[PDB]
Design an enzyme around this catalytic site. Structure first.
Site, mmCIF file in Angstrom:
data_model
loop_
_atom_site.group_PDB
_atom_site.id
_atom_site.type_symbol
_atom_site.label_atom_id
_atom_site.label_comp_id
_atom_site.label_asym_id
_atom_site.label_seq_id
_atom_site.Cartn_x
_atom_site.Cartn_y
_atom_site.Cartn_z
ATOM 1 N N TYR A 17 -38.984 22.233 -0.204
ATOM 2 C CA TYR A 17 -38.978 20.950 -0.925
ATOM 3 C C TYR A 17 -37.561 20.559 -1.273
ATOM 4 C CZ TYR A 17 -40.668 17.572 -4.469
ATOM 5 O OH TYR A 17 -40.928 16.455 -5.263
ATOM 6 N N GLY A 58 -37.880 28.523 -5.054
ATOM 7 C CA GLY A 58 -39.029 27.660 -4.786
ATOM 8 C C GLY A 58 -40.248 28.485 -4.402
ATOM 9 N N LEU A 79 -37.414 30.089 -12.021
ATOM 10 C CA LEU A 79 -37.904 29.892 -13.382
ATOM 11 C C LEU A 79 -39.304 29.331 -13.404
ATOM 12 C CD1 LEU A 79 -34.749 28.528 -15.217
ATOM 13 C CD2 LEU A 79 -35.629 30.851 -15.087
ATOM 14 N N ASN A 82 -45.285 28.864 -10.802
ATOM 15 C CA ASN A 82 -45.978 28.551 -9.555
ATOM 16 C C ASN A 82 -45.121 28.905 -8.346
ATOM 17 O OD1 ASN A 82 -48.141 27.576 -11.053
ATOM 18 N ND2 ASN A 82 -47.760 25.426 -10.580
ATOM 19 N N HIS A 83 -43.822 28.622 -8.423
ATOM 20 C CA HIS A 83 -42.898 29.076 -7.379
ATOM 21 C C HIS A 83 -42.940 30.587 -7.216
ATOM 22 C CE1 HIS A 83 -40.329 25.164 -7.629
ATOM 23 N NE2 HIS A 83 -41.573 24.958 -7.222
ATOM 24 N N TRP A 107 -30.800 33.276 -12.921
ATOM 25 C CA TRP A 107 -29.582 33.943 -12.459
ATOM 26 C C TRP A 107 -28.750 34.472 -13.621
ATOM 27 C CZ3 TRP A 107 -25.091 32.281 -14.450
ATOM 28 C CH2 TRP A 107 -25.006 30.957 -14.895
ATOM 29 N N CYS A 253 -35.427 7.491 -3.895
ATOM 30 C CA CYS A 253 -34.372 8.432 -3.545
ATOM 31 C C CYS A 253 -33.949 8.269 -2.090
ATOM 32 C CB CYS A 253 -34.807 9.860 -3.808
ATOM 33 S SG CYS A 253 -34.646 10.286 -5.500
#
Ligand SMILES: C[S@@+](CC[C@H](N)C(=O)[O-])C[C@H]1O[C@@H](n2cnc3c(N)ncnc32)[C@H](O)[C@@H]1O
Ligand code: NA
EC number: 2.1.1.-
Length: 271
Positions: A17, A58, A79, A82-83, A107, A253
Site C-alpha cells: 500500500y 505494513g 505499530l 492489523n499489519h 523503531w 492524491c
C-alpha cells in the site's frame, strides 16, 4: 479502524500500500509492486543469509518478497496490530530455513544489529522531532559497510513550487486539511532537506535519489479504479462515507502527484 477486508478490495495480492514501480509500462499492479520492492532491495546488495530490517512493514509484502527472492533473514516492525497479524501469518507460511519475524514494536525500541535496512513510506509518520534520532539509530544498528534504502514521501514549499511553475490553490489547502484530519498520509510531510540533512548529520552518504512521482500517480489511479469497481462491496464492508473518503484521497492524491505538488523517492544511503 478500517478492516483488512476493505483494503483487500483495491490492493493487489502482495497487500503493498505504497507507490508501485511500473518498470515496464505493461506491468500489472502486482508486478509493479514487486518491481518496487526489488528496485529497493537490489540497491542493498543483499547476499543470502544477511539480516534485513523493514521499518514499518505494513501487511508484510516486502518481507515476504525479501525472503522468497533474496533468501535473507528478515525482521519487520510495525505499530499497527492489523499489519503485524497479517505479516506474522504470511511469514510463518513461507517455507524457509531463515528467520522471518514480524513485531508490533516501534523503531525507537529496536536496538539489534542488522546488516541492511529498508523502509517504505513510514518516515512521514514520524514526528519531525525524531527525524535525526531515526537516522542515528539506523546508523548505529548497521555494520561499517551497511546500507539503508529509505523510500519516503516528501513535500515542497511555496518558493520551490513557484520556481518550478507550480502553485498551491485554495483547493489544495482544503485537501491538506482533509489529510491531517484523516488516516490518510500526506498531512505533515517532511521536506527533502528534512531527509537529506538529517541523514548526513548522522553519518550517511546519499549515494542515489530516485524519484517516483509519476509512478505514484499511476498507482493511486489504479487503486481508485479498483475501489470504484468494487464500490458495493466496499460500502458493505464499511460505509458509503468511508468509500467516498477513500475515493477523495486516492483521486486527490493522484492529481497532486501528477501536478508535482509532492514527491516520493528512494534514497540509497551508505556509511
Ligand atoms: C503507510 S504504511 C507502509 C506499509 C508497507 N511499508 C507498504 O509498503 O505497504 C506505514 C507502516 O509504518 C509503520 N510505522 C509507523 N511508525 C512506525 C514506527 N515509529 N516504527 C515502526 N513502524 C512504524 C505503520 O505502523 C505501518 O505499518
Ligand atoms: Na537457501
Amino acid at each position: 479502524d478500517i478492516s483488512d477486508d476493505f483494503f483487500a478490495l483495491f490492493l493487489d495480492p502482495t497487500w503493498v500500500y505504497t507507490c508501485a514501480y511500473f518498470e515496464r509500462d505493461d506491468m500489472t499492479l502486482e508486478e509493479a509492486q514487486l518491481a518496487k520492492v526489488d528496485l529497493a532491495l537490489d540497491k542493498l546488495n543483499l547476499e543470502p543469509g544477511m539480516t534485513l530490517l523493514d521499518v514499518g512493514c505494513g501487511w508484510g509484502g516486502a518481507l515476504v518478497r525479501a525472503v522468497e527472492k533474496y533468501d535473507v533473514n528478515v525482521i519487520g516492525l510495525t505499530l499497527s496490530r492489523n499489519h503485524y497479524e497479517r505479516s506474522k501469518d504470511r511469514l510463518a507460511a513461507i517455507g524457509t530455513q531463515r528467520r522471518a519475524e514480524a513485531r508490533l514494536q516501534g523503531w525507537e525500541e529496536f536496538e539489534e544489529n542488522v546488516d541492511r535496512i529498508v523502509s517504505f513510506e513510514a518516515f512521514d509518520a514520524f514526528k519531525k522531532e525524531r527525524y535525526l534520532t531515526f537516522f542515528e539509530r539506523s546508523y548505529d544498528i548497521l555494520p561499517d559497510d551497511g546500507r539503508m534504502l529509505l523510500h519516503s514521501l516528501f513535500t515542497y514549499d511555496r518558493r520551490w513550487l513557484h520556481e518550478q511553475g507550480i502553485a498551491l490553490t485554495m483547493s489544495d489547502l482544503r485537501f491538506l486539511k482533509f489529510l491531517r484530519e484523516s488516516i490518510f498520509p500526506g498531512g505533515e510531510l517532511p521536506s527533502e532537506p528534512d531527509i537529506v540533512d538529517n541523514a548526513q548529520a548522522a553519518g550517511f552518504t546519499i549515494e542515489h535519489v530516485q524519484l517516483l512521482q509519476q509512478h505514484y500517480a499511476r498507482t493511486l489511479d489504479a487503486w481508485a479504479a479498483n475501489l470504484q469497481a468494487a464500490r458495493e462491496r466496499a460500502i458493505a464492508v464499511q460505509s458509503e462515507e468511508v468509500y467516498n473518503n477513500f475515493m477523495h484521497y486516492l483521486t486527490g492524491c493522484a492529481e497532486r502527484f501528477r501536478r508535482g505538488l509532492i514527491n516520493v523517492a528512494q534514497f540509497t544511503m551508505t556509511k
